[PDB]
Each structure stands twice: as C-alpha cells, then as structure tokens.
Amino acid sequence: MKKLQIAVGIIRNENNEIFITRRAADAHMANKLEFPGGKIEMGETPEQAVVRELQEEVGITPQHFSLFEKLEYEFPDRHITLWFWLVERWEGEPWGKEGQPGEWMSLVGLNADDFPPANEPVIAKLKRL
Ligand SMILES: Nc1nc2c([nH]c(=O)n2[C@H]2C[C@H](O)[C@@H](COP(=O)(O)OP(=O)(O)OP(=O)(O)O)O2)c(=O)[nH]1
Ligand SMILES: OC[C@H]1O[C@@](CO)(O[C@H]2O[C@H](CO)[C@@H](O)[C@H](O)[C@H]2O)[C@@H](O)[C@@H]1O
Ligand SMILES: [Mn+2]
Ligand SMILES: [Mn+2]
Ligand SMILES: [Mn+2]
C-alpha cells in the first residue's frame, strides 16, 4: 500500500476564518473541502513542504507557523501521515492559484463531514481554540 507524507496549512485570518479549498472531482478525496497542502518531496523537510505547497496552491508564503497536529490515517488504498501547520502570518493574499475553488470559512461553521475523515480531530481541536 502507498505511504505518503503530506504537509498542509491551516490559514487563519484575524476574524477567525480559515482559507479552505475544494478538491477536484477526479482527485483522491474528490470534492472534499481541504486545507491547502500536498506531498512532502524527497530532500525537503515538512516545514519546507508546507511553504512550497501553499506558494503553489494559493500564492502565499507562510511564516512563523507552528505544528498544530501530526497524525496518521489509513485510507482504503493508501496510508498517509498528515502534518497540520497553523499559519497565522503570511506574505500574500490567498486565492485559487491552481484554478481550484477557495474561500474564507468561519472556524465555528466548519463541518468535519465536508473534509476527509483524517481531518476530524484537527477540526475539533481548532474549534476548541
Ligand atoms: N491537501 C490536503 N490533503 C488532505 C487533507 N486531508 C487529507 O486527508 N488529505 C489527503 C488527501 C490526499 O490523499 C493527500 C493530499 O495530497 P494532495 O493531492 O493535496 O497532494 P499534491 O497537492 O501534492 O498533489 P498534486 O496537486 O501534485 O496532484 O492527503 C487536507 O486537509 N488537505
Ligand atoms: O516547529 C514549529 C515551532 O518552532 C518554532 C520555534 O520554536 O518556530 C520555528 O519553526 C517554524 C516552522 O519552520 C518557523 O515558521 C518559525 O519562524 C521558527 O521560529 C515555534 O514558533 C513553532 O511552534
Ligand atoms: Mn499541490
Ligand atoms: Mn494538494
Ligand atoms: Mn505537490
């Protein structure tokens, strides 16, 4: 079974809203809401990966961020380790830089059912902030 390391960014503005994108219909976890992020490549660290992935996907450079949660999840056909970075400072304005839907969502209104099931404990912990 495939094993992947994934770094994602929880992008939180001053109004307690999170920048959330929606995954393509032909992707793994198709049509799900998601924190922007992606695969950690050989020769880069988890910290470097979340910077690169947010630059690619939404056009911001995260800075002074922290590891909010790290967890493992077994999907039906792949095992993934997810690094959830809390990003409260960044350069740029996030947008759908890869043509994907993206918008600001109130933290209190997030519904874990809309996200991959791996995100359930993270969404709960976020609402506890
Ligand atoms: N990006 C992201 N992926 C998540 C989340 N929760 C979750 O289980 N996943 C899973 C879905 C995928 O199996 C994997 C993310 O890989 P990805 O498809 O974003 O990887 P990528 O951006 O590097 O891929 P690509 O655009 O090059 O095709 O992790 C999340 O909140 N954000
Ligand atoms: O690992 C994140 C953790 O480390 C601290 C310093 O103790 O932040 C450092 O690492 C971040 C990720 O690379 C950087 O963004 C930050 O600038 C750097 O100081 C903590 O702030 C954070 O919890
Ligand atoms: Mn990507
Ligand atoms: Mn991605
Ligand atoms: Mn990638």
Coordinates of N, CA and C and ligand atoms in Angstrom, one line a residue:
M1 N 0.8 -1.2 0.0 CA 0.0 0.0 0.0 C 0.9 1.3 0.0
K2 N 0.5 2.2 -0.8 CA 1.2 3.5 -0.9 C 1.2 4.2 0.5
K3 N 2.4 4.8 0.8 CA 2.6 5.5 2.0 C 3.1 6.9 1.6
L4 N 2.4 8.0 2.1 CA 2.7 9.3 1.8 C 2.8 10.2 3.0
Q5 N 3.7 11.2 3.0 CA 3.8 12.3 4.0 C 3.2 13.5 3.3
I6 N 2.2 14.1 4.0 CA 1.5 15.3 3.5 C 1.6 16.5 4.4
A7 N 2.0 17.6 3.9 CA 2.0 18.9 4.7 C 0.9 19.8 4.3
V8 N 0.1 20.3 5.2 CA -1.0 21.2 4.9 C -1.0 22.4 5.8
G9 N -1.6 23.5 5.4 CA -1.6 24.7 6.2 C -3.0 25.2 6.5
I10 N -3.2 25.4 7.8 CA -4.5 25.9 8.4 C -4.3 27.4 8.4
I11 N -4.9 28.1 7.4 CA -4.6 29.5 7.1 C -5.7 30.3 7.8
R12 N -5.3 31.0 8.9 CA -6.3 31.6 9.8 C -6.1 33.1 9.8
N13 N -7.2 33.9 9.5 CA -7.1 35.3 9.5 C -7.5 35.9 10.8
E14 N -7.5 37.3 10.9 CA -7.8 37.9 12.2 C -9.2 37.8 12.6
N15 N -10.1 37.4 11.7 CA -11.5 37.3 12.0 C -11.9 35.8 12.3
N16 N -11.0 35.0 12.6 CA -11.3 33.6 12.9 C -11.9 32.8 11.8
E17 N -11.4 33.2 10.6 CA -11.8 32.5 9.3 C -10.6 31.7 8.8
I18 N -10.9 30.6 8.1 CA -9.8 29.7 7.6 C -10.0 29.7 6.1
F19 N -8.8 29.7 5.3 CA -8.9 29.7 3.9 C -8.9 28.3 3.4
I20 N -10.0 27.8 2.8 CA -10.4 26.5 2.5 C -10.5 26.3 1.0
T21 N -9.9 25.3 0.4 CA -10.1 25.0 -1.0 C -10.9 23.7 -1.1
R22 N -11.4 23.4 -2.3 CA -12.2 22.2 -2.6 C -11.5 21.4 -3.6
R23 N -11.4 20.1 -3.3 CA -10.6 19.2 -4.2 C -11.3 18.8 -5.4
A24 N -10.6 18.6 -6.5 CA -11.1 18.3 -7.8 C -11.9 17.0 -7.8
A25 N -12.8 16.8 -8.8 CA -13.7 15.7 -8.8 C -13.0 14.4 -9.1
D26 N -11.8 14.4 -9.7 CA -11.1 13.2 -10.1 C -9.9 13.0 -9.2
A27 N -9.8 13.7 -8.0 CA -8.7 13.5 -7.1 C -9.0 12.5 -6.1
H28 N -8.0 12.0 -5.4 CA -8.2 11.3 -4.1 C -9.0 12.3 -3.2
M29 N -9.9 11.7 -2.5 CA -10.8 12.6 -1.6 C -11.5 13.6 -2.5
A30 N -12.0 13.2 -3.6 CA -12.7 14.1 -4.6 C -13.8 14.9 -4.0
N31 N -13.8 16.2 -4.4 CA -14.9 17.1 -4.0 C -14.9 17.5 -2.5
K32 N -13.9 17.0 -1.7 CA -13.9 17.4 -0.3 C -13.3 18.7 -0.1
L33 N -13.7 19.4 1.0 CA -13.0 20.6 1.5 C -11.7 20.2 2.1
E34 N -10.7 21.1 2.0 CA -9.4 20.7 2.4 C -8.6 21.9 2.9
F35 N -7.6 21.7 3.7 CA -6.5 22.7 4.0 C -5.6 22.6 2.8
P36 N -5.2 23.7 2.2 CA -4.2 23.6 1.1 C -2.9 22.9 1.6
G37 N -2.3 22.1 0.7 CA -1.1 21.4 1.0 C -0.9 20.2 0.0
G38 N 0.1 19.4 0.3 CA 0.4 18.3 -0.6 C 1.6 17.5 -0.1
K39 N 2.2 16.7 -1.0 CA 3.1 15.7 -0.7 C 4.5 16.3 -0.4
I40 N 5.1 15.9 0.7 CA 6.5 16.2 1.1 C 7.4 15.4 0.1
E41 N 8.3 16.2 -0.6 CA 9.1 15.5 -1.6 C 10.4 15.1 -0.9
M42 N 11.1 14.2 -1.6 CA 12.4 13.8 -1.2 C 13.4 15.0 -1.1
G43 N 14.1 15.1 0.0 CA 15.1 16.2 0.1 C 14.5 17.5 0.6
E44 N 13.2 17.5 1.0 CA 12.7 18.7 1.6 C 12.1 18.3 3.0
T45 N 12.1 19.2 3.9 CA 11.5 19.0 5.2 C 10.0 19.2 5.2
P46 N 9.3 18.8 6.3 CA 7.9 19.2 6.4 C 7.6 20.7 6.4
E47 N 8.5 21.4 7.1 CA 8.4 22.9 7.1 C 8.6 23.5 5.7
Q48 N 9.6 23.0 4.9 CA 9.7 23.5 3.6 C 8.6 23.1 2.7
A49 N 8.0 21.9 2.9 CA 6.9 21.4 2.1 C 5.7 22.3 2.2
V50 N 5.3 22.7 3.5 CA 4.1 23.5 3.6 C 4.3 24.9 3.0
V51 N 5.5 25.4 3.1 CA 5.8 26.7 2.4 C 5.6 26.5 0.9
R52 N 6.2 25.5 0.3 CA 6.2 25.3 -1.1 C 4.8 25.1 -1.6
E53 N 4.0 24.2 -0.9 CA 2.7 23.8 -1.3 C 1.7 25.0 -1.2
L54 N 1.9 25.8 -0.2 CA 1.0 27.0 -0.1 C 1.4 28.0 -1.2
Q55 N 2.6 28.2 -1.5 CA 3.0 29.0 -2.6 C 2.4 28.6 -3.9
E56 N 2.5 27.3 -4.2 CA 2.0 26.7 -5.4 C 0.4 26.8 -5.5
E57 N -0.2 26.4 -4.4 CA -1.7 26.2 -4.5 C -2.4 27.5 -4.3
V58 N -2.0 28.4 -3.4 CA -2.8 29.5 -3.1 C -2.0 30.8 -3.1
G59 N -0.7 30.8 -3.4 CA 0.0 32.0 -3.7 C 0.4 32.8 -2.4
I60 N 0.6 32.1 -1.3 CA 1.1 32.8 -0.1 C 2.3 32.1 0.4
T61 N 3.2 32.8 1.1 CA 4.3 32.3 1.8 C 4.1 32.3 3.3
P62 N 3.8 31.2 3.9 CA 3.6 31.1 5.4 C 4.9 31.4 6.1
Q63 N 4.7 32.1 7.3 CA 5.9 32.4 8.1 C 5.5 32.4 9.6
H64 N 6.5 32.0 10.4 CA 6.3 31.9 11.9 C 5.1 31.1 12.2
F65 N 5.0 29.9 11.6 CA 3.9 28.9 11.8 C 4.3 27.9 12.8
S66 N 3.3 27.1 13.2 CA 3.6 26.1 14.2 C 2.9 24.8 13.8
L67 N 3.4 23.7 14.4 CA 2.8 22.4 14.1 C 1.6 22.2 15.0
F68 N 0.4 22.2 14.4 CA -0.8 22.1 15.2 C -1.1 20.7 15.5
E69 N -0.9 19.7 14.6 CA -1.2 18.3 14.8 C -0.5 17.5 13.8
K70 N 0.0 16.3 14.2 CA 0.5 15.4 13.2 C -0.2 14.0 13.5
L71 N -0.7 13.4 12.4 CA -1.5 12.2 12.6 C -1.3 11.3 11.4
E72 N -1.7 10.0 11.6 CA -1.7 9.1 10.5 C -3.1 8.6 10.3
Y73 N -3.4 8.3 9.0 CA -4.7 7.9 8.7 C -4.6 6.8 7.6
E74 N -5.3 5.7 7.8 CA -5.4 4.6 6.8 C -6.6 4.8 5.9
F75 N -6.4 5.2 4.7 CA -7.5 5.2 3.7 C -7.6 3.9 3.1
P76 N -8.7 3.6 2.3 CA -8.9 2.3 1.7 C -7.7 1.8 0.9
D77 N -7.0 2.7 0.2 CA -5.9 2.3 -0.7 C -4.6 3.0 -0.5
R78 N -4.5 3.7 0.6 CA -3.2 4.4 0.9 C -3.1 4.8 2.3
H79 N -1.9 4.9 2.8 CA -1.6 5.3 4.2 C -1.0 6.7 4.1
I80 N -1.5 7.6 4.9 CA -0.9 9.0 4.8 C -0.6 9.5 6.2
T81 N 0.5 10.2 6.4 CA 0.8 10.9 7.6 C 0.6 12.4 7.2
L82 N -0.2 13.1 8.0 CA -0.6 14.5 7.8 C 0.1 15.4 8.8
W83 N 0.7 16.4 8.3 CA 1.3 17.4 9.2 C 0.5 18.7 9.0
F84 N -0.3 19.0 10.1 CA -1.2 20.2 10.0 C -0.5 21.4 10.7
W85 N -0.1 22.3 9.9 CA 0.6 23.5 10.3 C -0.4 24.7 10.5
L86 N -0.4 25.3 11.6 CA -1.2 26.5 11.9 C -0.5 27.8 11.4
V87 N -1.1 28.4 10.4 CA -0.5 29.5 9.7 C -1.3 30.8 10.0
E88 N -0.8 31.7 10.9 CA -1.4 32.9 11.2 C -0.8 34.1 10.7
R89 N 0.4 34.0 10.0 CA 1.1 35.1 9.4 C 1.6 34.6 8.0
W90 N 1.5 35.5 7.0 CA 1.9 35.1 5.7 C 2.1 36.3 4.9
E91 N 2.9 36.1 3.8 CA 3.0 37.1 2.7 C 2.1 36.8 1.6
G92 N 1.3 37.7 1.1 CA 0.4 37.5 0.0 C -1.0 37.4 0.5
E93 N -1.9 37.2 -0.5 CA -3.3 37.1 -0.3 C -3.8 35.8 -1.0
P94 N -4.3 34.8 -0.2 CA -4.6 33.5 -0.8 C -5.7 33.6 -1.8
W95 N -5.6 32.8 -2.9 CA -6.5 32.7 -4.0 C -6.4 31.3 -4.6
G96 N -7.3 31.1 -5.6 CA -7.3 29.8 -6.3 C -6.3 29.7 -7.3
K97 N -5.0 29.7 -6.9 CA -3.9 29.9 -7.9 C -3.8 28.8 -8.9
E98 N -4.3 27.6 -8.5 CA -4.3 26.4 -9.4 C -5.7 26.2 -10.1
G99 N -6.5 27.3 -10.1 CA -7.9 27.2 -10.7 C -8.9 26.5 -9.8
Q100 N -8.6 26.2 -8.5 CA -9.5 25.5 -7.6 C -10.3 26.4 -6.8
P101 N -11.5 26.0 -6.4 CA -12.3 26.9 -5.5 C -11.7 27.1 -4.2
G102 N -11.7 28.4 -3.7 CA -11.1 28.7 -2.4 C -11.9 29.8 -1.8
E103 N -12.2 29.7 -0.5 CA -12.8 30.8 0.1 C -12.6 30.8 1.6
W104 N -12.9 31.9 2.3 CA -12.7 32.0 3.7 C -14.0 31.4 4.4
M105 N -13.7 30.6 5.4 CA -14.8 30.0 6.1 C -14.7 30.2 7.6
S106 N -15.7 30.6 8.3 CA -15.6 30.8 9.7 C -15.2 29.5 10.4
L107 N -14.3 29.5 11.3 CA -13.9 28.4 12.1 C -15.1 27.7 12.7
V108 N -16.0 28.5 13.4 CA -17.1 27.9 14.1 C -18.1 27.1 13.2
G109 N -18.1 27.5 11.9 CA -19.0 26.9 11.0 C -18.5 25.7 10.2
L110 N -17.2 25.3 10.4 CA -16.7 24.2 9.7 C -17.4 22.9 10.1
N111 N -17.7 22.1 9.1 CA -18.3 20.8 9.3 C -17.3 19.7 8.9
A112 N -16.9 18.9 9.9 CA -15.9 17.9 9.6 C -16.3 16.9 8.5
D113 N -17.7 16.7 8.4 CA -18.1 15.8 7.3 C -17.8 16.3 5.9
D114 N -17.5 17.6 5.8 CA -17.2 18.1 4.5 C -15.7 17.9 4.1
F115 N -14.9 17.4 5.0 CA -13.4 17.2 4.9 C -13.1 15.8 4.8
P116 N -11.9 15.4 4.4 CA -11.5 14.0 4.5 C -11.6 13.6 6.0
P117 N -11.9 12.3 6.2 CA -12.1 11.8 7.6 C -10.9 12.0 8.5
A118 N -9.7 12.0 7.8 CA -8.5 12.2 8.6 C -8.4 13.5 9.3
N119 N -9.2 14.5 8.9 CA -9.2 15.8 9.5 C -10.1 15.9 10.7
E120 N -10.9 14.9 11.1 CA -11.8 15.1 12.1 C -11.3 15.6 13.5
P121 N -10.2 15.0 14.0 CA -9.7 15.5 15.3 C -9.1 16.9 15.2
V122 N -8.6 17.3 14.0 CA -8.0 18.6 13.8 C -9.1 19.7 13.8
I123 N -10.2 19.4 13.1 CA -11.3 20.4 13.1 C -11.9 20.5 14.5
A124 N -12.0 19.5 15.2 CA -12.5 19.6 16.6 C -11.5 20.4 17.4
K125 N -10.2 20.1 17.3 CA -9.3 20.8 18.1 C -9.2 22.3 17.8
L126 N -9.4 22.6 16.5 CA -9.4 24.0 16.0 C -10.6 24.8 16.7
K127 N -11.8 24.2 16.7 CA -12.9 24.8 17.3 C -12.8 25.0 18.8
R128 N -11.8 24.3 19.5 CA -11.5 24.5 20.9 C -10.6 25.7 21.2
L129 N -10.0 26.3 20.2 CA -9.1 27.4 20.4 C -9.8 28.6 21.0
Ligands
LIG1 N1 -4.2 18.9 0.8 C1 -4.9 18.2 1.8 N2 -4.9 16.9 1.7 C2 -5.6 16.2 2.6 C3 -6.2 16.8 3.7 N3 -6.8 15.8 4.5 C4 -6.4 14.7 3.9 O1 -6.8 13.5 4.3 N4 -5.7 14.8 2.8 C5 -5.2 13.8 1.9 C6 -5.8 13.8 0.5 C7 -4.7 13.3 -0.3 O2 -4.7 11.9 -0.2 C8 -3.4 13.8 0.4 C9 -3.1 15.2 -0.1 O3 -2.4 15.1 -1.3 P1 -2.6 16.2 -2.5 O4 -3.4 15.6 -3.6 O5 -3.0 17.5 -1.9 O6 -1.1 16.3 -3.0 P2 -0.5 17.3 -4.0 O7 -1.1 18.7 -3.9 O8 1.0 17.1 -3.6 O9 -0.8 16.6 -5.4 P3 -0.9 17.2 -6.9 O10 -1.6 18.5 -6.8 O11 0.5 17.3 -7.3 O12 -1.7 16.2 -7.7 O13 -3.8 13.9 1.7 C10 -6.2 18.2 3.7 O14 -6.8 18.9 4.6 N5 -5.5 18.9 2.7
LIG2 O1 8.3 23.8 14.7 C1 7.5 24.9 14.8 C2 7.7 25.6 16.1 O2 9.1 26.1 16.1 C3 9.1 27.5 16.4 C4 10.3 27.9 17.2 O3 10.3 27.1 18.4 O4 9.0 28.1 15.1 C5 10.1 27.9 14.3 O5 9.7 27.0 13.2 C6 8.7 27.5 12.4 C7 8.5 26.5 11.2 O6 9.6 26.4 10.5 C8 9.0 28.8 11.8 O7 8.0 29.3 11.0 C9 9.4 29.8 12.9 O8 9.8 31.0 12.3 C10 10.5 29.2 13.7 O9 10.9 30.1 14.8 C11 7.8 27.7 17.1 O10 7.3 29.1 16.9 C12 6.8 26.7 16.5 O11 5.8 26.3 17.4
MN3 MN -0.2 20.7 -4.5
MN4 MN -2.7 19.5 -2.7
MN5 MN 2.6 18.5 -4.7

